[PDB]
Amino acid sequence: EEDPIFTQLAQKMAAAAPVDLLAQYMQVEAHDWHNRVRGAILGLISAVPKVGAAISRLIGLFWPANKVDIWEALRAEEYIRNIVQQELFEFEMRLLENDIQALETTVGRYDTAALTEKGNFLSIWISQADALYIRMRNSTNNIHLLLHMVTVSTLHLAALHERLTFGEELYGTNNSTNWTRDLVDKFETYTSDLIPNVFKRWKEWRPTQIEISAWVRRGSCGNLTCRPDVSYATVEDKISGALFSFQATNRNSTTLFLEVCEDHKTRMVNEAIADMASCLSPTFAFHKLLPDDIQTQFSPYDRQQFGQVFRGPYSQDLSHGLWTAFKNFRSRTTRSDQTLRDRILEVIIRAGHHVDAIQFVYDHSNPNLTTPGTVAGNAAGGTRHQVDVRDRPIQELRMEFSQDVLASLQLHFEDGTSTRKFGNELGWATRILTCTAPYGYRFSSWAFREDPGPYRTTAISVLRFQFTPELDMPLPASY
Amino acid sequence: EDPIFTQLAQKMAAAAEKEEVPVDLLAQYMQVEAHDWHNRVRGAILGLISAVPKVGAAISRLIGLFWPANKVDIWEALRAEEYIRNIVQQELFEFEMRLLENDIQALETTVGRYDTAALTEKGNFLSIWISQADALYIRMRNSTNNIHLLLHMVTVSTLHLAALHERLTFGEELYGTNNSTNWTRDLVDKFETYTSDLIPNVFKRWKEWRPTQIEISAWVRRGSCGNLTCRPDVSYATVEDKISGALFSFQATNRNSTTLFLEVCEDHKTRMVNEAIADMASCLSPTFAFHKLLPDDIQTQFSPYDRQQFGQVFRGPYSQDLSHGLWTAFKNFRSRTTRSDQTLRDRILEVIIRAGHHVDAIQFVYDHSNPNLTTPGTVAGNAAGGTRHQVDVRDRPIQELRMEFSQDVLASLQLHFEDGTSTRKFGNELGWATRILTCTAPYGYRFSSWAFREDPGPYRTTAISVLRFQFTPELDMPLPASY
């Protein structure tokens, strides 16, 4: 007995025939919790001017009849395994169970209350949500509860928004100055203090779980041969479990492999920070709960912490698991594009057998003009492809590496459509890597390394992509 | 920088001037190093027959491969074998090797003494080599963790048979007497015990153990009507390999069952076991060349390897469903093949690929008793659909197959050849691949057969949704130039 959704998706792809709607749906499900939190916030802004209407929608998303609840949906978040230790926030949540049930009881009582009793339950809701967040924030394992803090802060500000929006209906008085100040103050505490500061503590911890080991065995002449010196190094992430091993003979050095190991650590930390930033990105929509007339007085998020996140770098060298020889490893970018403009209008790709050139083309203060990015690679080589990405944001970039350089590039758009693969039309890809936008973030910039390629022209050997929060990200239909 | 990387870079630049699709010589070299131990063992065996019969010459060649000046030794080359992490526990054979260190050191002393000795002294040292080599293998065989020393057994059995071959080949000028009858019987007897008893039987014990490291767990949390909602029943299942660390997770709401996900978890376990067996089979494949050490006139009297254990190994199955890590709903999972091609013929002459937007049909064309004729295999998929691509794989064996999956079916196929050249990608010329999977022949094995599952694709035609590839040992596999 199959779940009917898979049947409908198979028929929908037949009807369309095109986009892999099956894969599309499952990628939405991977971010179920994320979509619920965003869905609940968007509901508070868009919903009919009717007391409890938006809150009823929030309850439907967070505590549906036929689906997992918000707390267990949280457990299944795609990125969770790379950023926090499941077992630690499992323990903390056993201590918070009765406080969470109490808050849920109050949320339910507000929903079912007559208008004359709603005001009382909302006050209790506000207090309970406030206390529950303070508990999580004061916990020894607070950094592992960061997604639980996104959930509770959402419930807190939902109630504060409800109280301001419908305050005269709930209480009768005109205390809108107080109701406004209360929303603003708790908005500030979360978005300017508690979320950034706990994220900073988390960011200091995450790299400590990646251990670099370097050692040597001195050569030995005995009966049969003279065995050479062997220098070794390993970089292991205890969270993700990713392991990269290096060794080189006829060398006696504990420093030889530190640079490439540190580059791998930076890369793993980049991936971890981007994942966490994504999971916190729903809190960047709290800004939209503030009255329109004061929205320009507040930042939607802490730009130092969340303004810039990275995936990669990517290279043929960075993909190899176990080295038996010492190479001049292409393990990081050596050139960064402009970052001032954070919206891409076009991507220019020159390509023949390999990728000849990449240029991001950004927006301009004057919306009629554009800001040409740095030209990576050979500006004269191959065929020039101008991909207009106005009205189709980039969701994923696929890179193929061959002969130690970038062989091809392909863009995957938000709606699931894609470009042609540019370069390596006929050839075999040694490595295939997919750079996926952190959910809630857009491509904002990039960095690269250039090297002489096998055609004795400038090739792109290393790529790293930079992202900034997307404050106007559309949700899937069902949300 | 190691001078090899600059050399490889220059060679690819030279080739780029002439060839439309040049070979990744860098990747090619690094894939040879990934199997350094394997290549050394094969190179050592081959060198006994390859060399014009000259006393000590083949043994000198073996010593150069096993204990070089500017590379790691045979024992540490072993540790770095690509497949090792999927098959054996390193800590367990580390523990055993510490107990065997002084015996290995003794055998190595004797090998060096044989190599450096004058002709009149060589004979004595070779006899000591034989005794020490035999004794060391029995210690590994009798070992508590013998299954984890299988690659070490491959190494010692090579050293043991190398010496027995040397004694038969040069026995007259070593010892003076002609005892070729006894020397033949000794080589045959040890060849037999290794290839027909000890390697097959320890492999059987290993094969019994490897599946036990894969755990399947199923449980349910029943629904609860409290204050604010009625929480639904959730059914869970997991399949985890404690060796590779591979983990696949399943859950479905509004279902109360511990049986729902057992079939898909069992199919994952079967797939994980397939990949492990193929990995280990590859590692033991150099012992299949022991046969070539036997005198030409008796080679037809012996099997080069145990066909039941090593005749057929598998990689996959591969499908879009099988690649997904965490499921939040129940699907009719496409997790195993439903139809296997013929297996009687085990040499492929051609692969026919029909493709349009996706792969329409695949057919393997095998050898025939009559070398003028062929044996067309079963046609998988839509025999009429797409553009027909006939790939002649006479003179270019298949090293790797690349599969792209999109819309729950096979979107494209691409062939990677032994020499590093490839075909075009057939299908999905302009599209985005949901999943990309590479099926790499176990090193020492060639593609011998395949199995598949068919499903209706999005274009209302028969599509290929699941692929599994079967392999048989390649007894005439060439070595890289280096070896």
Side-chain angles (χ1 to χ4, degrees), chain A residues 2-479, chain B:
Chain A
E2 189 177 57
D3 189 324
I5 190 63
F6 292 114
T7 317
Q8 289 159 29
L9 287 162
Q11 289 179 359
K12 270 186 175 290
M13 286 185 289
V19 176
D20 187 346
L21 296 169
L22 170 59
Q24 192 187 61
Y25 154 76
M26 284 164 67
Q27 286 151 28
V28 166
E29 263 295 289
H31 292 305
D32 184 22
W33 166 87
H34 189 136
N35 289 321
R36 293 191 189 196
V37 174
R38 285 195 174 273
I41 292 164
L42 262 59
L44 292 164
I45 297 148
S46 57
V48 58
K50 179 199 187 71
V51 63
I55 288 298
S56 189
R57 163 164 190 77
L58 178 146
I59 293 160
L61 293 169
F62 276 34
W63 299 280
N66 293 312
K67 298 198 77 182
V68 164
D69 76 13
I70 190 68
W71 303 112
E72 174 182 6
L74 173 42
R75 297 172 57 79
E77 158 54 33
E78 197 176 336
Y79 302 141
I80 203 77
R81 295 159 293 165
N82 187 41
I83 57 172
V84 300
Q85 302 196 354
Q86 168 171 241
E87 292 79 359
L88 292 188
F89 70 68
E90 272 174 351
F91 179 66
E92 293 297 342
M93 281 289 287
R94 300 196 199 100
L95 296 172
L96 298 168
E97 176 62 3
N98 293 306
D99 283 5
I100 288 168
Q101 284 185 17
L103 176 53
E104 281 175 3
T105 306
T106 309
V107 168
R109 281 162 175 173
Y110 177 77
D111 187 41
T112 60
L115 183 48
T116 54
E117 285 80 62
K118 264 184 160 62
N120 297 338
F121 291 120
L122 193 66
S123 160
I124 300 296
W125 176 332
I126 294 274
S127 298
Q128 285 177 320
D130 188 47
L132 176 58
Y133 193 103
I134 294 296
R135 285 203 67 184
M136 290 183 179
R137 182 258 195 161
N138 285 329
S139 165
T140 54
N141 301 308
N142 60 345
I143 61 165
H144 304 276
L145 282 162
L146 263 167
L147 281 80
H148 298 79
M149 287 172 189
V150 173
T151 312
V152 169
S153 62
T154 293
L155 291 175
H156 195 165
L157 293 182
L160 282 164
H161 179 275
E162 181 75 353
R163 203 177 65 117
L164 171 57
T165 301
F166 301 103
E168 74 174 41
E169 292 90 335
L170 287 166
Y171 304 113
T173 66
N174 198 329
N175 233 311
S176 64
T177 300
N178 284 6
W179 305 327
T180 301
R181 190 192 58 251
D182 290 355
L183 180 65
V184 163
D185 283 22
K186 283 293 167 184
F187 160 84
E188 264 192 317
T189 55
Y190 286 137
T191 63
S192 72
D193 176 5
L194 300 184
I195 292 161
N197 287 327
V198 173
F199 172 72
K200 273 201 282 196
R201 197 175 101 79
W202 174 89
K203 188 161 54 163
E204 289 168 35
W205 165 84
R206 186 59 181 78
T208 65
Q209 300 295 109
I210 307 163
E211 64 166 308
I212 295 170
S213 311
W215 71 98
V216 179
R217 190 202 309 110
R218 286 175 66 84
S220 185
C221 294
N223 307 329
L224 172 58
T225 197
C226 280
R227 296 176 201 275
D229 299 333
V230 189
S231 303
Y232 308 83
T234 63
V235 56
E236 196 188 351
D237 179 21
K238 286 288 190 170
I239 304 309
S240 73
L243 173 63
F244 293 86
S245 307
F246 302 82
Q247 67 189 50
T249 64
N250 285 51
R251 289 174 198 257
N252 181 341
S253 183
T254 194
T255 60
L256 179 63
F257 291 118
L258 287 178
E259 194 187 357
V260 66
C261 284
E262 209 71 69
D263 283 2
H264 269 296
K265 180 161 167 159
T266 301
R267 179 191 58 78
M268 289 168 185
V269 166
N270 286 345
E271 295 298 335
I273 286 166
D275 285 357
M276 179 53 81
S278 171
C279 292
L280 296 181
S281 71
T283 69
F284 307 167
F286 291 162
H287 187 251
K288 297 187 173 303
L289 302 171
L290 302 182
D292 305 315
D293 60 340
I294 67 167
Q295 277 191 22
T296 65
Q297 302 185 30
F298 302 93
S299 302
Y301 61 84
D302 187 301
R303 287 192 64 75
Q304 173 170 50
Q305 296 310 321
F306 305 124
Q308 47 291 318
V309 301
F310 305 88
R311 290 214 188 284
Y314 305 96
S315 76
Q316 192 164 324
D317 282 348
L318 281 170
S319 286
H320 194 75
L322 201 146
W323 293 85
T324 66
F326 179 76
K327 189 183 190 289
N328 287 339
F329 303 110
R330 305 176 177 187
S331 53
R332 70 185 170 203
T333 59
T334 57
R335 208 154 172 248
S336 287
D337 203 10
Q338 75 83 57
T339 64
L340 184 49
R341 311 308 303 179
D342 59 23
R343 297 183 167 282
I344 307 162
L345 300 187
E346 304 171 1
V347 178
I348 289 63
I349 309 157
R350 296 196 75 99
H353 298 298
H354 295 149
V355 176
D356 283 288
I358 304 171
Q359 183 184 29
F360 284 24
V361 172
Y362 306 89
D363 69 346
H364 198 290
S365 306
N366 188 340
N368 305 331
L369 303 187
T370 68
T371 304
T374 303
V375 176
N378 171 18
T383 302
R384 189 174 185 279
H385 307 273
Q386 180 268 322
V387 185
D388 189 356
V389 300
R390 299 169 220 243
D391 314 319
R392 48 180 189 174
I394 307 295
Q395 196 261 322
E396 294 181 323
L397 299 185
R398 187 153 284 156
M399 297 150 285
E400 299 182 325
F401 296 88
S402 297
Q403 308 159 250
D404 213 26
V405 299
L406 182 72
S408 70
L409 187 66
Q410 187 182 20
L411 319 191
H412 195 210
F413 301 114
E414 184 176 65
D415 66 352
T417 61
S418 73
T419 65
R420 216 200 83 202
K421 191 186 78 173
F422 299 105
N424 193 34
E425 180 186 17
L426 304 176
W428 178 271
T430 301
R431 291 294 184 175
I432 308 170
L433 289 139
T434 309
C435 175
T436 308
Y439 195 52
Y441 275 73
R442 62 158 181 278
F443 286 86
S444 61
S445 186
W446 77 300
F448 54 90
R449 177 181 159 154
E450 293 168 320
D451 286 292
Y455 299 91
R456 306 181 197 281
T457 56
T458 309
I460 300 163
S461 65
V462 190
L463 299 93
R464 186 196 63 195
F465 294 100
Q466 183 179 329
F467 306 91
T468 204
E470 176 52 61
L471 303 185
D472 299 305
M473 191 178 75
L475 273 62
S478 181
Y479 301 95
Chain B
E1 184 176 67
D2 188 310
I4 196 69
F5 292 115
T6 316
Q7 289 166 7
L8 288 162
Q10 288 170 218
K11 285 180 180 290
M12 288 187 293
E17 295 183 39
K18 330 189 203 309
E19 301 171 37
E20 201 74 78
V21 183
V23 182
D24 193 341
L25 293 175
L26 175 58
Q28 193 188 56
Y29 157 77
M30 290 179 66
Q31 287 160 37
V32 170
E33 270 294 286
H35 294 301
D36 189 13
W37 167 82
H38 189 124
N39 288 311
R40 291 183 192 199
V41 174
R42 282 191 175 271
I45 295 165
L46 188 140
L48 291 162
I49 315 149
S50 179
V52 159
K54 223 75 194 173
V55 66
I59 297 299
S60 183
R61 176 63 178 170
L62 177 151
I63 284 166
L65 293 173
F66 274 38
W67 300 278
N70 309 309
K71 295 192 74 179
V72 166
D73 71 32
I74 192 69
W75 301 106
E76 181 185 2
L78 191 153
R79 293 167 55 78
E81 159 56 38
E82 198 174 44
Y83 303 144
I84 201 76
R85 163 65 187 188
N86 192 35
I87 55 174
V88 295
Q89 287 179 272
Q90 193 186 83
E91 68 273 9
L92 295 191
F93 76 62
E94 272 177 349
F95 298 166
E96 297 294 345
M97 279 292 284
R98 285 185 209 129
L99 301 178
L100 304 170
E101 176 57 21
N102 291 114
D103 287 357
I104 289 168
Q105 198 171 306
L107 175 55
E108 283 177 3
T109 300
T110 309
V111 169
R113 281 168 172 171
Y114 179 88
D115 188 42
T116 57
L119 187 64
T120 57
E121 281 76 68
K122 272 186 155 59
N124 170 52
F125 290 126
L126 196 59
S127 301
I128 295 162
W129 184 333
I130 295 298
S131 309
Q132 285 175 325
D134 185 60
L136 181 57
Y137 194 100
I138 299 302
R139 286 202 71 192
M140 292 181 175
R141 188 273 192 103
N142 294 341
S143 183
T144 308
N145 302 301
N146 55 357
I147 58 163
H148 301 279
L149 289 160
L150 268 171
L151 275 79
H152 299 82
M153 286 165 174
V154 165
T155 312
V156 173
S157 63
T158 299
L159 284 171
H160 191 190
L161 289 180
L164 284 175
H165 180 271
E166 183 79 354
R167 197 177 65 181
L168 171 57
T169 305
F170 306 108
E172 186 145 25
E173 68 182 314
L174 282 168
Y175 302 91
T177 186
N178 191 310
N179 202 5
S180 55
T181 307
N182 286 339
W183 296 330
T184 302
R185 197 182 68 245
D186 293 344
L187 179 60
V188 164
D189 284 339
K190 284 305 169 192
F191 164 85
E192 266 198 294
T193 47
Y194 283 141
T195 59
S196 66
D197 184 0
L198 298 185
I199 289 159
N201 283 318
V202 174
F203 173 77
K204 264 201 276 191
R205 210 180 99 82
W206 172 90
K207 188 166 57 167
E208 195 183 17
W209 160 86
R210 186 62 184 78
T212 68
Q213 298 284 42
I214 304 162
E215 175 161 21
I216 299 165
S217 323
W219 72 99
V220 178
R221 192 190 56 264
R222 287 283 269 167
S224 185
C225 286
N227 307 143
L228 158 80
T229 204
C230 285
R231 300 182 192 285
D233 293 346
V234 193
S235 298
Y236 306 83
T238 60
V239 58
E240 190 184 13
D241 176 28
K242 295 190 302 194
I243 298 302
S244 73
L247 174 63
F248 292 83
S249 303
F250 300 86
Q251 71 186 58
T253 65
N254 293 120
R255 286 180 198 260
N256 176 31
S257 172
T258 186
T259 178
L260 180 64
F261 292 115
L262 282 181
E263 183 177 312
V264 66
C265 284
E266 207 69 60
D267 283 6
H268 265 297
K269 172 163 179 166
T270 297
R271 178 190 61 76
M272 289 171 184
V273 168
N274 285 341
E275 293 287 357
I277 286 168
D279 280 1
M280 178 54 86
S282 165
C283 294
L284 300 179
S285 68
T287 66
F288 307 165
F290 287 165
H291 188 259
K292 302 178 181 294
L293 301 182
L294 297 174
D296 297 347
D297 61 338
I298 67 164
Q299 274 187 25
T300 59
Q301 297 182 27
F302 300 96
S303 317
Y305 61 84
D306 184 303
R307 286 197 62 80
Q308 177 177 40
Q309 295 314 311
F310 306 123
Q312 45 289 326
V313 296
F314 306 87
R315 293 213 182 284
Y318 308 95
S319 76
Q320 198 166 312
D321 285 359
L322 277 163
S323 311
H324 191 74
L326 199 155
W327 290 91
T328 69
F330 178 68
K331 190 179 186 288
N332 285 155
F333 299 113
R334 305 176 179 181
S335 53
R336 75 189 170 205
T337 60
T338 58
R339 184 149 170 74
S340 301
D341 201 359
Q342 72 82 56
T343 60
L344 178 50
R345 309 315 302 187
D346 63 25
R347 287 163 185 281
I348 306 160
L349 297 182
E350 315 174 344
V351 182
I352 289 80
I353 306 160
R354 304 195 66 99
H357 298 308
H358 296 324
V359 178
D360 286 285
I362 296 167
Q363 184 188 31
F364 281 40
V365 180
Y366 303 93
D367 255 41
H368 196 284
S369 305
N370 187 333
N372 301 315
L373 305 176
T374 75
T375 311
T378 305
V379 175
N382 176 9
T387 302
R388 189 168 181 278
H389 301 281
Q390 187 278 335
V391 184
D392 177 37
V393 305
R394 295 177 190 86
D395 305 313
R396 46 179 187 175
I398 307 304
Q399 198 255 314
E400 303 183 302
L401 300 179
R402 187 149 285 156
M403 296 154 282
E404 296 183 330
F405 295 92
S406 189
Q407 302 183 296
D408 211 21
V409 299
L410 179 66
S412 75
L413 191 67
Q414 189 174 19
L415 313 185
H416 195 206
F417 299 121
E418 186 185 48
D419 66 8
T421 64
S422 57
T423 62
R424 251 198 50 215
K425 186 180 75 162
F426 300 117
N428 191 39
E429 282 71 23
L430 307 178
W432 181 271
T434 301
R435 286 289 172 175
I436 311 169
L437 281 144
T438 303
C439 172
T440 302
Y443 192 59
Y445 279 69
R446 58 154 186 276
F447 285 87
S448 66
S449 190
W450 80 306
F452 59 90
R453 184 197 155 95
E454 295 164 321
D455 281 297
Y459 299 97
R460 318 197 177 285
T461 47
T462 305
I464 305 161
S465 65
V466 192
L467 298 90
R468 188 195 63 194
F469 294 100
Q470 178 173 333
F471 304 88
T472 206
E474 176 51 66
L475 301 192
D476 297 310
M477 192 178 64
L479 305 184
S482 316
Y483 306 85

